[PDB]
Coordinates of C-alpha atoms and ligand atoms in Angstrom, one line a residue:
Chain A
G4 CA 3.6 96.4 -31.9
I5 CA 7.0 96.7 -30.2
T6 CA 6.7 100.5 -29.4
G7 CA 5.3 100.9 -26.0
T8 CA 5.9 100.5 -22.3
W9 CA 6.7 97.0 -21.2
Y10 CA 7.2 95.4 -17.7
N11 CA 9.2 92.3 -17.0
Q12 CA 8.8 89.6 -14.3
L13 CA 10.9 91.5 -11.8
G14 CA 8.9 94.7 -12.3
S15 CA 11.5 96.5 -14.4
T16 CA 10.2 99.0 -17.0
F17 CA 11.2 99.0 -20.7
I18 CA 10.0 102.1 -22.6
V19 CA 10.9 101.6 -26.3
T20 CA 10.2 103.1 -29.6
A21 CA 10.7 100.9 -32.7
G22 CA 11.8 103.0 -35.7
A23 CA 10.7 102.2 -39.2
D24 CA 14.1 100.9 -40.3
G25 CA 15.1 98.7 -37.4
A26 CA 16.1 101.0 -34.5
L27 CA 15.1 100.5 -30.9
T28 CA 15.5 103.5 -28.7
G29 CA 14.3 104.3 -25.2
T30 CA 14.9 103.8 -21.4
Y31 CA 15.2 101.0 -19.0
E32 CA 14.6 101.0 -15.3
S33 CA 15.6 97.9 -13.4
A34 CA 13.7 96.9 -10.2
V35 CA 16.9 95.1 -9.0
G36 CA 20.6 95.3 -8.9
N37 CA 23.2 98.0 -8.9
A38 CA 20.8 100.4 -10.6
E39 CA 18.5 103.3 -9.9
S40 CA 16.1 105.3 -12.1
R41 CA 16.3 105.3 -15.9
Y42 CA 19.1 104.3 -18.2
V43 CA 19.5 104.8 -22.0
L44 CA 19.0 101.8 -24.2
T45 CA 19.6 101.2 -27.9
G46 CA 19.1 98.2 -30.0
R47 CA 17.8 96.7 -33.2
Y48 CA 14.8 94.6 -34.5
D49 CA 13.8 92.9 -37.6
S50 CA 11.6 95.5 -39.4
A51 CA 10.3 92.9 -42.0
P52 CA 9.6 89.7 -40.0
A53 CA 8.3 86.5 -41.5
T54 CA 4.5 86.2 -41.9
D55 CA 4.3 82.5 -41.1
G56 CA 3.6 82.8 -37.3
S57 CA 7.2 83.4 -36.3
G58 CA 8.2 86.0 -33.8
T59 CA 10.1 89.2 -34.5
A60 CA 13.8 89.0 -33.5
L61 CA 15.2 91.9 -31.5
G62 CA 17.9 92.9 -29.1
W63 CA 19.0 95.8 -27.0
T64 CA 21.8 97.0 -24.6
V65 CA 21.9 99.1 -21.5
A66 CA 25.2 100.3 -20.1
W67 CA 24.5 100.8 -16.3
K68 CA 25.8 104.4 -16.1
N69 CA 23.4 107.3 -15.6
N70 CA 23.5 110.6 -13.7
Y71 CA 23.0 108.9 -10.4
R72 CA 25.4 105.9 -10.5
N73 CA 27.7 103.7 -12.5
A74 CA 27.8 100.0 -12.0
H75 CA 30.6 99.5 -14.6
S76 CA 28.4 96.9 -16.3
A77 CA 26.2 96.3 -19.3
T78 CA 23.3 94.0 -20.1
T79 CA 22.2 92.8 -23.5
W80 CA 18.8 91.2 -24.1
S81 CA 18.3 89.0 -27.2
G82 CA 14.8 87.7 -27.9
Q83 CA 11.7 87.8 -29.9
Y84 CA 8.4 89.7 -29.9
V85 CA 5.4 87.4 -30.0
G86 CA 2.2 89.1 -31.3
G87 CA -1.2 88.1 -30.0
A88 CA -4.1 88.9 -27.7
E89 CA -1.5 89.5 -25.1
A90 CA 1.7 90.6 -26.7
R91 CA 4.9 89.4 -25.1
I92 CA 8.6 89.8 -25.5
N93 CA 10.7 86.7 -24.5
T94 CA 14.4 87.3 -23.9
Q95 CA 17.6 85.8 -22.7
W96 CA 20.2 88.3 -21.3
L97 CA 23.9 88.6 -20.6
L98 CA 25.1 91.0 -17.9
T99 CA 28.8 91.7 -18.1
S100 CA 30.7 93.6 -15.4
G101 CA 34.1 95.3 -16.0
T102 CA 36.6 93.1 -14.2
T103 CA 40.3 92.4 -13.9
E104 CA 41.7 89.6 -16.1
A105 CA 42.0 87.4 -13.0
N106 CA 38.3 87.8 -12.3
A107 CA 37.0 87.6 -15.9
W108 CA 35.7 84.1 -15.4
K109 CA 33.0 85.5 -13.1
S110 CA 32.2 88.6 -15.2
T111 CA 29.0 87.5 -16.8
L112 CA 25.5 86.7 -15.5
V113 CA 22.9 85.0 -17.7
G114 CA 19.2 85.0 -17.3
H115 CA 15.8 85.3 -19.0
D116 CA 13.2 88.0 -18.9
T117 CA 9.7 88.0 -20.2
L118 CA 7.9 91.2 -20.8
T119 CA 4.2 92.2 -21.2
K120 CA 2.5 95.6 -21.5
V121 CA 0.7 95.0 -18.1
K122 CA 1.6 97.4 -15.3
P123 CA 2.3 95.8 -11.9
Chain B
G4 CA 40.3 103.0 -27.5
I5 CA 37.1 101.3 -28.7
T6 CA 36.6 103.3 -31.9
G7 CA 37.8 101.6 -35.0
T8 CA 38.0 98.2 -36.8
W9 CA 38.2 94.9 -34.9
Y10 CA 38.4 91.3 -36.1
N11 CA 37.2 88.2 -34.4
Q12 CA 38.3 84.6 -34.3
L13 CA 35.8 83.6 -37.1
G14 CA 37.0 86.3 -39.5
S15 CA 34.2 88.7 -38.9
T16 CA 34.8 92.5 -38.9
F17 CA 33.4 94.9 -36.3
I18 CA 33.6 98.6 -37.2
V19 CA 32.5 100.8 -34.3
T20 CA 32.5 104.4 -33.1
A21 CA 32.3 105.0 -29.4
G22 CA 30.6 108.4 -28.7
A23 CA 31.5 110.5 -25.7
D24 CA 28.1 109.8 -24.0
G25 CA 28.2 106.0 -24.1
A26 CA 26.8 105.3 -27.7
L27 CA 28.2 102.6 -29.9
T28 CA 27.4 102.9 -33.6
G29 CA 28.8 101.1 -36.7
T30 CA 28.7 98.0 -38.9
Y31 CA 29.2 94.3 -38.5
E32 CA 30.2 91.8 -41.2
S33 CA 30.0 88.2 -40.4
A34 CA 32.2 85.6 -41.9
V35 CA 29.7 82.8 -41.0
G36 CA 26.0 82.1 -40.9
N37 CA 23.0 83.6 -42.9
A38 CA 24.7 86.9 -43.5
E39 CA 26.2 88.9 -46.4
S40 CA 27.9 92.3 -46.4
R41 CA 27.6 94.8 -43.6
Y42 CA 24.8 95.2 -41.1
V43 CA 23.9 98.1 -38.8
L44 CA 24.9 97.8 -35.1
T45 CA 24.0 99.9 -32.2
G46 CA 24.9 99.6 -28.6
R47 CA 26.2 101.1 -25.4
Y48 CA 29.4 101.2 -23.4
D49 CA 30.5 102.5 -20.0
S50 CA 31.9 106.0 -20.8
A51 CA 33.5 106.4 -17.3
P52 CA 35.1 103.0 -16.5
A53 CA 37.2 102.1 -13.5
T54 CA 40.9 103.2 -13.8
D55 CA 42.5 100.1 -12.0
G56 CA 43.1 98.0 -15.1
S57 CA 39.6 96.5 -15.1
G58 CA 37.7 96.2 -18.4
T59 CA 35.2 98.6 -19.9
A60 CA 31.7 97.0 -20.1
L61 CA 29.9 97.2 -23.4
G62 CA 27.3 95.6 -25.6
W63 CA 25.8 95.8 -29.0
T64 CA 23.0 94.4 -31.2
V65 CA 22.8 93.4 -34.9
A66 CA 19.4 92.6 -36.4
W67 CA 20.4 90.4 -39.5
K68 CA 18.5 92.4 -42.1
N69 CA 20.3 94.7 -44.6
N70 CA 19.7 95.7 -48.2
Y71 CA 20.7 92.3 -49.4
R72 CA 18.9 89.8 -47.2
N73 CA 17.1 89.1 -43.9
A74 CA 17.8 86.1 -41.7
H75 CA 15.0 87.0 -39.3
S76 CA 17.4 86.9 -36.3
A77 CA 19.3 89.2 -34.0
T78 CA 22.6 88.8 -32.1
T79 CA 23.6 90.6 -28.9
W80 CA 27.2 90.7 -27.7
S81 CA 27.9 91.5 -24.0
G82 CA 31.4 91.9 -22.9
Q83 CA 34.4 94.1 -21.9
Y84 CA 37.1 96.1 -23.7
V85 CA 40.6 95.6 -22.3
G86 CA 43.2 98.1 -23.6
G87 CA 47.0 98.1 -23.8
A88 CA 49.5 96.5 -26.1
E89 CA 47.3 93.5 -26.8
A90 CA 43.9 95.2 -26.8
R91 CA 40.9 93.0 -26.8
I92 CA 37.1 93.0 -26.7
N93 CA 36.0 89.8 -25.0
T94 CA 32.3 88.9 -25.4
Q95 CA 29.6 86.3 -25.0
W96 CA 26.7 86.5 -27.4
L97 CA 23.1 85.4 -27.8
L98 CA 21.7 84.8 -31.3
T99 CA 17.9 84.6 -31.3
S100 CA 16.0 83.6 -34.4
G101 CA 12.3 84.4 -35.0
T102 CA 10.5 81.1 -34.4
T103 CA 7.0 79.8 -33.9
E104 CA 6.0 79.3 -30.2
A105 CA 6.3 75.5 -30.6
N106 CA 9.9 75.9 -31.8
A107 CA 10.9 78.7 -29.3
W108 CA 12.9 76.3 -27.2
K109 CA 15.5 76.2 -30.0
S110 CA 15.4 79.9 -30.8
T111 CA 18.7 80.9 -29.2
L112 CA 22.3 80.1 -29.9
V113 CA 25.0 81.1 -27.4
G114 CA 28.7 81.6 -27.9
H115 CA 31.8 83.7 -27.3
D116 CA 33.8 86.0 -29.5
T117 CA 37.2 87.6 -29.0
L118 CA 38.0 90.7 -31.0
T119 CA 41.5 92.0 -31.6
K120 CA 43.0 95.0 -33.5
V121 CA 44.9 92.6 -35.8
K122 CA 43.4 89.6 -37.7
Chain C
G4 CA 12.3 66.9 -1.9
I5 CA 14.1 66.3 -5.2
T6 CA 13.5 62.5 -5.7
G7 CA 10.6 61.7 -8.0
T8 CA 8.9 62.8 -11.2
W9 CA 9.0 66.3 -12.5
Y10 CA 7.5 67.9 -15.6
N11 CA 8.7 71.0 -17.5
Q12 CA 6.9 73.7 -19.5
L13 CA 7.4 71.7 -22.8
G14 CA 5.8 68.6 -21.4
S15 CA 9.1 66.7 -20.8
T16 CA 9.5 64.2 -18.0
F17 CA 12.4 64.2 -15.5
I18 CA 12.6 61.1 -13.3
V19 CA 15.4 61.4 -10.6
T20 CA 16.7 59.9 -7.4
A21 CA 18.7 62.2 -5.2
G22 CA 21.2 60.1 -3.2
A23 CA 22.7 60.8 0.2
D24 CA 26.1 61.0 -1.6
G25 CA 25.0 64.2 -3.6
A26 CA 24.3 62.2 -6.7
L27 CA 21.4 62.6 -9.1
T28 CA 20.5 59.5 -11.2
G29 CA 17.5 58.8 -13.4
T30 CA 15.9 59.3 -16.8
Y31 CA 14.8 62.2 -19.0
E32 CA 12.1 62.0 -21.7
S33 CA 11.9 65.1 -24.0
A34 CA 8.7 66.2 -25.6
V35 CA 10.7 68.0 -28.3
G36 CA 13.7 67.7 -30.5
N37 CA 15.6 64.7 -31.8
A38 CA 14.6 62.4 -29.0
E39 CA 12.3 59.5 -28.3
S40 CA 11.7 57.5 -25.2
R41 CA 14.0 57.7 -22.1
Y42 CA 17.6 58.8 -21.8
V43 CA 20.0 58.2 -18.9
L44 CA 20.8 61.3 -16.8
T45 CA 23.4 61.8 -14.1
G46 CA 24.2 64.9 -12.0
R47 CA 24.9 66.3 -8.6
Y48 CA 23.2 68.4 -6.0
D49 CA 24.0 70.3 -2.8
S50 CA 23.1 67.8 -0.1
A51 CA 23.4 70.5 2.7
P52 CA 21.8 73.7 1.4
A53 CA 22.2 77.0 3.0
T54 CA 20.8 77.3 6.5
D55 CA 18.6 80.4 5.2
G56 CA 15.7 80.4 2.7
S57 CA 17.9 79.7 -0.4
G58 CA 17.4 77.2 -3.1
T59 CA 19.3 74.0 -3.5
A60 CA 21.9 74.2 -6.3
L61 CA 22.0 71.2 -8.8
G62 CA 22.8 70.2 -12.2
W63 CA 22.5 67.2 -14.6
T64 CA 23.5 66.0 -18.0
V65 CA 21.8 63.9 -20.7
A66 CA 23.7 62.7 -23.8
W67 CA 21.0 62.1 -26.4
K68 CA 21.9 58.5 -27.3
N69 CA 19.7 55.6 -26.2
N70 CA 18.7 52.2 -27.7
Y71 CA 16.6 53.9 -30.4
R72 CA 18.4 57.0 -31.6
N73 CA 21.5 59.1 -31.3
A74 CA 21.2 62.8 -31.9
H75 CA 25.0 63.4 -31.4
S76 CA 24.3 66.0 -28.7
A77 CA 24.2 66.6 -25.0
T78 CA 22.3 68.9 -22.7
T79 CA 23.3 70.2 -19.3
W80 CA 20.9 71.8 -16.9
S81 CA 22.1 74.1 -14.1
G82 CA 19.7 75.4 -11.6
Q83 CA 18.1 75.3 -8.2
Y84 CA 15.4 73.4 -6.4
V85 CA 12.9 75.5 -4.4
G86 CA 10.7 73.4 -2.1
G87 CA 7.3 74.0 -0.6
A88 CA 3.7 73.8 -1.7
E89 CA 4.6 75.0 -5.2
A90 CA 7.9 73.2 -5.4
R91 CA 10.0 74.1 -8.5
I92 CA 13.3 73.2 -10.1
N93 CA 14.3 76.4 -12.1
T94 CA 17.1 75.8 -14.6
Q95 CA 19.0 77.2 -17.5
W96 CA 20.5 74.7 -20.0
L97 CA 23.1 74.4 -22.7
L98 CA 22.5 71.9 -25.6
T99 CA 25.7 71.2 -27.5
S100 CA 25.7 69.2 -30.7
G101 CA 28.8 67.6 -32.1
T102 CA 30.0 69.7 -35.0
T103 CA 32.9 70.2 -37.3
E104 CA 35.3 73.0 -36.2
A105 CA 34.1 75.3 -39.0
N106 CA 30.5 75.0 -37.6
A107 CA 31.4 75.1 -33.9
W108 CA 30.2 78.7 -33.5
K109 CA 26.7 77.3 -33.9
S110 CA 27.1 74.2 -31.8
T111 CA 25.3 75.4 -28.6
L112 CA 21.6 76.3 -27.9
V113 CA 20.7 78.0 -24.6
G114 CA 17.4 78.1 -22.8
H115 CA 15.5 77.8 -19.5
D116 CA 13.2 75.1 -18.1
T117 CA 11.0 75.2 -15.1
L118 CA 10.0 71.9 -13.6
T119 CA 7.0 71.3 -11.4
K120 CA 5.5 68.3 -9.6
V121 CA 2.3 68.6 -11.7
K122 CA 2.3 68.6 -15.5
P123 CA 1.3 72.0 -16.9
Chain D
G4 CA 40.2 59.9 -26.0
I5 CA 38.3 61.6 -23.2
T6 CA 39.6 59.5 -20.3
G7 CA 42.6 61.3 -18.7
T8 CA 43.7 64.4 -16.8
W9 CA 42.9 67.7 -18.4
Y10 CA 43.7 71.3 -17.5
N11 CA 41.7 74.4 -18.5
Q12 CA 42.7 77.9 -19.3
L13 CA 42.5 78.9 -15.6
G14 CA 44.7 76.1 -14.5
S15 CA 41.8 74.0 -13.1
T16 CA 42.2 70.2 -13.2
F17 CA 39.6 67.8 -14.7
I18 CA 40.3 64.1 -14.0
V19 CA 37.8 62.0 -15.9
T20 CA 37.1 58.4 -16.9
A21 CA 34.8 57.8 -19.9
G22 CA 33.0 54.5 -19.5
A23 CA 31.6 52.3 -22.3
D24 CA 28.0 53.0 -21.0
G25 CA 28.4 56.8 -21.9
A26 CA 29.3 57.8 -18.3
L27 CA 31.8 60.4 -17.2
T28 CA 33.1 60.1 -13.6
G29 CA 36.0 61.8 -11.8
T30 CA 37.0 64.8 -9.9
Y31 CA 37.4 68.5 -10.5
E32 CA 39.7 71.0 -8.8
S33 CA 39.1 74.7 -9.5
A34 CA 41.9 77.3 -9.7
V35 CA 39.4 80.0 -8.8
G36 CA 36.2 80.7 -6.9
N37 CA 34.7 79.4 -3.7
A38 CA 36.4 76.1 -3.8
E39 CA 39.2 74.0 -2.3
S40 CA 40.6 70.6 -3.1
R41 CA 38.7 68.1 -5.2
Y42 CA 35.0 67.8 -5.9
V43 CA 33.1 64.8 -7.4
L44 CA 31.8 65.1 -11.0
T45 CA 29.5 63.0 -13.0
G46 CA 28.4 63.4 -16.6
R47 CA 27.6 61.8 -20.0
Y48 CA 29.0 61.7 -23.4
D49 CA 28.1 60.4 -26.8
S50 CA 29.7 57.0 -27.0
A51 CA 29.0 56.5 -30.7
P52 CA 29.9 59.9 -32.3
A53 CA 29.6 60.8 -35.9
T54 CA 32.5 59.7 -38.2
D55 CA 32.2 62.9 -40.5
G56 CA 34.8 65.0 -38.6
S57 CA 32.4 66.2 -36.0
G58 CA 33.2 66.5 -32.3
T59 CA 31.9 64.3 -29.5
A60 CA 29.2 65.9 -27.4
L61 CA 29.6 65.7 -23.6
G62 CA 28.6 67.4 -20.4
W63 CA 29.3 67.1 -16.7
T64 CA 28.3 68.6 -13.3
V65 CA 30.1 69.6 -10.2
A66 CA 28.1 70.5 -7.0
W67 CA 30.6 72.6 -5.0
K68 CA 30.3 70.7 -1.7
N69 CA 33.0 68.4 -0.4
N70 CA 34.3 67.4 3.0
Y71 CA 36.0 70.8 3.5
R72 CA 33.7 73.5 2.0
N73 CA 30.2 74.2 0.7
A74 CA 29.7 77.0 -1.8
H75 CA 26.0 76.1 -2.2
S76 CA 26.4 76.2 -6.0
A77 CA 26.7 73.9 -9.0
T78 CA 28.4 74.1 -12.4
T79 CA 27.5 72.3 -15.6
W80 CA 29.8 72.2 -18.6
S81 CA 28.3 71.4 -22.0
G82 CA 30.6 71.0 -24.9
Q83 CA 32.5 68.7 -27.3
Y84 CA 35.7 66.7 -27.5
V85 CA 37.7 67.5 -30.6
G86 CA 40.0 64.5 -31.4
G87 CA 43.0 66.1 -33.3
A88 CA 46.7 65.5 -32.9
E89 CA 46.3 67.8 -29.9
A90 CA 42.9 66.8 -28.5
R91 CA 40.9 69.5 -26.9
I92 CA 37.6 69.8 -25.0
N93 CA 35.7 73.1 -25.7
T94 CA 32.8 73.9 -23.3
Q95 CA 30.4 76.5 -22.2
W96 CA 29.3 76.5 -18.6
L97 CA 26.5 77.6 -16.2
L98 CA 27.3 78.1 -12.6
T99 CA 24.2 78.4 -10.5
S100 CA 24.3 79.5 -6.9
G101 CA 21.5 78.7 -4.5
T102 CA 19.7 82.1 -3.9
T103 CA 16.5 83.5 -2.4
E104 CA 13.6 84.0 -4.7
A105 CA 14.2 87.8 -4.8
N106 CA 17.9 87.3 -5.8
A107 CA 17.3 84.4 -8.3
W108 CA 17.8 86.9 -11.2
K109 CA 21.5 86.9 -10.3
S110 CA 21.9 83.2 -9.6
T111 CA 23.7 82.1 -12.7
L112 CA 27.1 82.9 -14.2
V113 CA 28.0 81.9 -17.7
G114 CA 31.4 81.3 -19.3
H115 CA 33.5 79.1 -21.5
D116 CA 36.4 76.7 -20.7
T117 CA 38.8 75.0 -23.1
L118 CA 40.9 72.1 -21.9
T119 CA 43.9 70.1 -23.1
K120 CA 46.1 67.4 -21.5
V121 CA 49.1 69.8 -21.3
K122 CA 50.2 70.4 -17.7
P123 CA 50.7 74.1 -17.2
Ligands
BTN201 O1 23.7 95.2 -11.1 C1 24.1 95.7 -12.2 O2 25.2 95.5 -12.6 C2 23.2 96.6 -13.0 C3 21.7 96.3 -13.0 C4 21.4 94.9 -13.6 C5 19.9 94.5 -13.6 C6 19.7 93.2 -14.4 S1 19.7 93.4 -16.2 C7 19.1 91.7 -16.2 C8 18.0 91.6 -15.2 N1 16.7 92.1 -15.7 C9 16.4 93.3 -15.1 O3 15.3 94.0 -15.4 N2 17.2 93.6 -14.1 C10 18.3 92.6 -14.1
BTN202 O1 22.9 83.2 -39.2 C1 22.3 84.2 -38.8 O2 21.1 84.2 -38.3 C2 22.9 85.6 -38.9 C3 24.5 85.6 -38.8 C4 24.9 85.2 -37.4 C5 26.4 85.2 -37.3 C6 26.9 84.9 -35.8 S1 26.6 86.3 -34.7 C7 27.6 85.5 -33.4 C8 28.8 84.9 -34.2 N1 29.9 85.8 -34.3 C9 30.1 86.2 -35.6 O3 31.0 87.0 -36.0 N2 29.2 85.5 -36.4 C10 28.4 84.6 -35.7
BTN203 O1 17.4 67.6 -30.3 C1 18.4 67.1 -29.6 O2 19.6 67.4 -29.9 C2 18.1 66.3 -28.4 C3 16.8 66.7 -27.7 C4 17.0 68.0 -26.9 C5 15.8 68.5 -26.2 C6 16.0 69.8 -25.4 S1 17.0 69.6 -24.0 C7 16.6 71.3 -23.5 C8 15.1 71.4 -23.7 N1 14.3 70.9 -22.6 C9 13.7 69.8 -23.0 O3 12.9 69.1 -22.2 N2 13.8 69.5 -24.2 C10 14.7 70.4 -24.9
BTN204 O1 32.6 79.8 -6.6 C1 31.8 78.8 -6.6 O2 30.6 78.9 -6.5 C2 32.4 77.5 -6.8 C3 33.6 77.4 -7.8 C4 33.3 77.7 -9.2 C5 34.5 77.7 -10.1 C6 34.1 77.9 -11.6 S1 33.2 76.6 -12.4 C7 33.4 77.4 -14.0 C8 34.8 78.1 -14.0 N1 35.8 77.0 -14.5 C9 36.7 76.7 -13.5 O3 37.6 75.8 -13.6 N2 36.4 77.4 -12.4 C10 35.3 78.3 -12.5

């Protein structure tokens, strides 16, 4: 159910393939921030989730460098896939920028993204 | 500078290879939690960082399933590599457990790990 | 715009008075977790928000001890108040439980609550 | 115990009084960021912690407005007091800036501060 094209609340696009042994591969395009076009992502998911109603744990990373720009930053999303009539991925994320040691206290933004397969 | 074995403040071991393109691949072994032996990790790093002494941004994911057990959870670490005599990878992490929707509010732990070349 | 009763997505109830001195005072009642009845909250808010269309930054703390139980934990919420017809307080939170040092790595849950004037 | 003057790893100063009612009151002065001089804080702590070696849960809030400056932001620290020979407070924090709706995704920084009573 994870394999597909997903969109978050900002209008960003998450194109992912879930491999049979836990791999996530694909591309991410952010609607916001110091970013343009598509970026490589990789991650992991639980390929044998519980069967008791629980979601499927997963996470992935984007380093914000591509052929067009380099933000010197990386985001990781940690969350779960929730199956149902409308499948959803609920995440929290951490966006770390490369900083000097003096500025490291303000290196990391935190937020939450929810994704569905509905195109905006 | 990223490639190799790193140790965190909990006694865990991060073994990673940084590819020329920005790929991170390797294994993670946690000293704590619902974990035994090594787990696959994958992630990404900035392969063309600033040259002013700023850190190199990176992140990786472990899904806590291996040949030996499955915790039904995943951790992501987001942080930066700082090189030099006292090299370090400083991270914050999010550990999400599969939950029912009613329990989703308590799905996610947050913390911070510092990794060094010597334990 | 802040003083009064607010409800989050879990069904919890936030009762607050925003004082001229920047103070937040009131009670919190959680629909979930190791909690029953009302708990004291205190916090702070920006009493002179930006002259533009920006939210009002605020935060508050509950220690989860009242006359009935003690969960040996505390939650802080950090966020912003957005006024208008569909007024909202959008927050992220950190729930820290008292733990031994060996277990400190798993002391802190993170999440996000959205509060509205009408119960969802 | 908690009452006293604490310094964090950045050199910031946390002057706090822990009341018998579970209240924290005092002032905070940051070594970094969009801040000058002292700011009011308020928070809560577990006034009847466990006796099994666990820490004491606590949290507090600063809104970054005083007589001199307004950053239109608020930080909450959530953590625990660890009562060794050398007492320490270990926290994680959320710093939310007031933003427009379109920029709300980048409203919140996350980090971790550790404090002791040792004057740097
Ligand atoms: O500005 C940067 O440093 C790079 C782009 C960051 C975009 C972030 S990642 C978290 C959030 N979710 C999105 O889809 N976009 C923003
Ligand atoms: O308990 C689980 O669900 C799986 C093991 C989690 C171990 C966590 S990941 C973040 C922190 N850093 C570590 O080295 N181990 C813990
Ligand atoms: O279980 C505990 O330790 C005390 C109750 C915690 C309830 C949390 S606070 C964050 C979230 N928002 C709520 O309204 N309830 C939960
Ligand atoms: O820049 C601002 O918006 C106001 C000042 C914020 C200072 C932060 S709060 C968390 C961290 N710990 C500190 O002692 N200072 C910084």
